Amino acid sequence: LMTQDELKRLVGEAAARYVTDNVPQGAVIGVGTGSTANCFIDALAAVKDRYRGAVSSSVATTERLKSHGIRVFDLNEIESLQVYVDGADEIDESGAMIKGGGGALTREKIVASVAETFVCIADASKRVAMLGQFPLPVEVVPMARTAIGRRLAALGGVPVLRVKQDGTPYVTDNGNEILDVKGLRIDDPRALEAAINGWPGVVTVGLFAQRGADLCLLGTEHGVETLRYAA
Amino acid sequence: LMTQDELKRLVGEAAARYVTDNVPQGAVIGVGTGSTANCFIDALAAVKDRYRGAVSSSVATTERLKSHGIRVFDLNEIESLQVYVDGADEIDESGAMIKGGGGALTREKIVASVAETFVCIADASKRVAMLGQFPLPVEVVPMARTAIGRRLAALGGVPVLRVKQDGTPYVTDNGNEILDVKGLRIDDPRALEAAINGWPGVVTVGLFAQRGADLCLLGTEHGVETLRYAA
Ligand SMILES: [K+]
Ligand SMILES: [K+]
């Protein structure tokens, strides 16, 4: 019996081993966001002296990295990254992911765009036949909130403006709102990502499909599976 | 002999006439940004009582509209717009435009997305055989500045971070930077818009091509020409 937390530790450790097996000494590591990514951070901390530091995908991740004395570089200082290690809210058989549930959509997608290899770390619950039962985050310019909402509704999506504990709109780092869209059945993630990216007022869509996972270390009740997807 | 300012007044007046000819009493008018759009604002002000008010594409436009006592609605309050009247930095034969030179890229593209009809108002200098000699504005998340720069450079573009008079980075309403990209020869604006929109870290690209002009009132030294483009 392994709890979800134990499966997350297991994939975090497995990703640290993937990095030490595949990424040479002195490298800068691209680092994701979320509870699973935090397990990877803690595991990577035990070999931190082998690497020059990290690029971070969120304030929360930067904070955790610094709590281990890991140097954090601004992505603008970095020309390339071999690896980016991050979770997913969902991942399908093509390696397309929904991400952004905890809000860091935009910076995750930026760091992922620079990295040669996206290593998804996930417990078994994240692997789904078809994306969309986890609500799709769409980061939007505030003046476009209802325009984008209408476009999502025309697809049968149920758009929910993300709110704080106090019921005022969650606002991201770039002064933007998030619409979490429910009820979509995303049988073609690449095509839907392209469509949503064509909408003025969309900042980032939490479909990582045109650039999805290159591999996934999936923590199951029978151990870690390594899933690989087409370059 | 008509100066450029006189040609801009001429198309502003022509667009006011287009609105009163085509947009019924009580409508809300979508309003662009820039010196040409300001001529249209001044002309529309003379028939302002015929319309309920306006949606604005910038702080500057909101200010000018209010200076005429025109009511300004937040786009989120508005379900549809018949018309959006705005300038362009350049427009080609397909009605594709480069816009954003004066910074309001993102809100212009949002309001344009809601309007059924985009009326471009421009003096004759704006009509070009091929887009790109006017630098292409790309609004970008700051952490993605160099990543997007590299992608533009790979196309032969020369990306220039927009700066204020004091040489600190211009920062937009959403806390974002602008890269003005020179040296592109944009023979397929729709294809390049789609490509740039697929880049994480891009907020808005100042190519209006997938949704371009529906018509253009072009102020020439022989009067206003009405150019029309495929729905
Ligand atoms: K997240
Ligand atoms: K502008």
Side-chain angles (χ1 to χ4, degrees), chain A residues 1-8 10-164 166-173 175-231, chain B residues 1-8 10-164 166-173 175-231:
Chain A
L1 174 48
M2 286 191 278
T3 66
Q4 192 186 9
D5 286 345
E6 286 166 319
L7 295 173
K8 290 166 165 180
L10 197 74
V11 299
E13 294 172 352
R17 180 53 48 85
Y18 178 97
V19 170
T20 68
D21 283 352
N22 293 283
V23 183
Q25 174 192 55
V28 172
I29 309 307
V31 181
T33 294
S35 68
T36 313
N38 286 353
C39 287
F40 165 66
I41 290 165
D42 296 346
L44 182 74
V47 294
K48 70 178 175 207
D49 290 342
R50 186 172 187 73
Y51 296 107
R52 200 190 182 173
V55 172
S56 169
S57 58
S58 64
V59 175
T61 291
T62 296
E63 286 185 11
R64 202 185 189 91
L65 289 168
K66 290 172 172 190
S67 79
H68 290 283
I70 294 162
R71 180 182 180 173
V72 176
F73 292 88
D74 178 76
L75 179 61
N76 292 303
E77 305 178 59
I78 297 306
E79 305 190 340
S80 62
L81 290 173
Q82 188 187 330
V83 305
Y84 177 69
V85 178
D86 199 6
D89 300 308
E90 290 178 330
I91 182 158
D92 72 13
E93 290 301 296
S94 74
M97 296 166 291
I98 287 184
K99 287 178 55 53
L105 183 40
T106 290
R107 296 182 48 186
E108 294 169 353
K109 215 175 188 178
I110 297 169
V111 185
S113 75
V114 171
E116 303 164 31
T117 306
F118 190 121
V119 178
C120 181
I121 50 173
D123 70 82
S125 75
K126 306 308 190 54
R127 188 194 196 169
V128 294
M130 190 181 296
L131 302 173
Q133 298 191 218
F134 190 94
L136 176 59
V138 181
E139 183 162 344
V140 292
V141 178
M143 97 169 272
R145 176 182 46 81
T146 59
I148 299 317
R150 283 191 308 272
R151 289 182 182 269
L152 296 157
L155 304 168
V158 177
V160 183
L161 179 64
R162 193 176 299 188
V163 290
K164 297 167 212 161
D166 82 349
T168 56
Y170 181 84
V171 168
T172 72
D173 326 19
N176 299 309
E177 289 176 324
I178 298 291
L179 301 177
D180 294 298
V181 193
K182 310 184 176 187
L184 296 174
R185 305 296 172 243
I186 307 173
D187 65 284
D188 193 340
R190 286 191 309 207
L192 185 57
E193 189 188 352
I196 298 172
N197 283 331
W199 300 342
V202 170
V203 177
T204 305
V205 61
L207 275 177
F208 287 44
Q210 296 186 327
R211 197 275 183 279
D214 294 294
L215 63 140
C216 175
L217 303 173
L218 194 76
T220 81
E221 293 298 324
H222 56 265
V224 178
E225 290 187 358
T226 306
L227 307 178
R228 288 197 180 269
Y229 311 96
Chain B
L1 174 48
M2 286 191 278
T3 66
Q4 192 186 9
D5 286 345
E6 286 166 319
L7 295 173
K8 290 166 165 180
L10 197 74
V11 299
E13 294 172 352
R17 180 53 48 85
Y18 178 97
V19 170
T20 68
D21 283 352
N22 293 283
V23 183
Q25 174 192 55
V28 172
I29 309 307
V31 181
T33 294
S35 68
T36 313
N38 286 353
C39 287
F40 165 66
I41 290 165
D42 296 346
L44 182 74
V47 294
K48 70 178 175 207
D49 290 342
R50 186 172 187 73
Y51 296 107
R52 200 190 182 173
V55 172
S56 169
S57 58
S58 64
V59 175
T61 291
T62 296
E63 286 185 11
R64 202 185 189 91
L65 289 168
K66 290 172 172 190
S67 79
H68 290 283
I70 294 162
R71 180 182 180 173
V72 176
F73 292 88
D74 178 76
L75 179 61
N76 292 303
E77 305 178 59
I78 297 306
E79 305 190 340
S80 62
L81 290 173
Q82 188 187 330
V83 305
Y84 177 69
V85 178
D86 199 6
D89 300 308
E90 290 178 330
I91 182 158
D92 72 13
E93 290 301 296
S94 74
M97 296 166 291
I98 287 184
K99 287 178 55 53
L105 183 40
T106 290
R107 296 182 48 186
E108 294 169 353
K109 215 175 188 178
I110 297 169
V111 185
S113 75
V114 171
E116 303 164 31
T117 306
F118 190 121
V119 178
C120 181
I121 50 173
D123 70 82
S125 75
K126 306 308 190 54
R127 188 194 196 169
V128 294
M130 190 181 296
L131 302 173
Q133 298 191 218
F134 190 94
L136 176 59
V138 181
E139 183 162 344
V140 292
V141 178
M143 97 169 272
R145 176 182 46 81
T146 59
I148 299 317
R150 283 191 308 272
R151 289 182 182 269
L152 296 157
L155 304 168
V158 177
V160 183
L161 179 64
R162 193 176 299 188
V163 290
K164 297 167 212 161
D166 82 349
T168 56
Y170 181 84
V171 168
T172 72
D173 326 19
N176 299 309
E177 289 176 324
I178 298 291
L179 301 177
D180 294 298
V181 193
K182 310 184 176 187
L184 296 174
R185 305 296 172 243
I186 307 173
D187 65 284
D188 193 340
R190 286 191 309 207
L192 185 57
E193 189 188 352
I196 298 172
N197 283 331
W199 300 342
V202 170
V203 177
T204 305
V205 61
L207 275 177
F208 287 44
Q210 296 186 327
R211 197 275 183 279
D214 294 294
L215 63 140
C216 175
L217 303 173
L218 194 76
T220 81
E221 293 298 324
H222 56 265
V224 178
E225 290 187 358
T226 306
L227 307 178
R228 288 197 180 269
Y229 311 96

